[PDB]
Design a protein around this ligand. Structure first.
Ligand SMILES: [Zn+2]
Lengths: 98, 6
């Protein structure tokens, strides 16, 4: 089955609009940024706001948010289902509901 | 657009 979190190229505002209607904290999606070619962003619902994280890439081609690195978006997402996306707030990724 | 990790 394809992943329910890959939304492709959707504007940041649309992502917020959609995530705001979600009922659970941690509801998220990965989108292709309009800020730069071939870049990804992670948008997550938390409380009454939507937080955005820029998916960084290093020289070897690994993805990362802070320090830990991943060989794919799939691994990054799966990791953050059990480990908080932030050290300051407890945010665990969970699939959106349709 | 603000990013938490930036
Ligand atoms: Zn539910």
């Amino acid at each position: 089955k394809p992943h329910p979190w890959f939304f492709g190229k959707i504007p940041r505002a649309k992502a917020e609009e959609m995530l705001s209607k979600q009922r659970h904290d941690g509801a998220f999606l990965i989108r292709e940024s309009e800020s730069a070619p071939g870049d990804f962003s992670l948008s997550v619902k938390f409380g009454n706001d939507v937080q955005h994280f820029k998916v960084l890439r290093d020289g070897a081609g690994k993805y990362f948010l802070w320090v830990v690195k991943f060989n794919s978006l799939n691994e990054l997402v799966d990791y953050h289902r059990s480990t908080s996306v932030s050290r300051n707030q407890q945010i665990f990724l969970r699939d959106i509901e349709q | 657009x603000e990013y938490i990790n930036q």
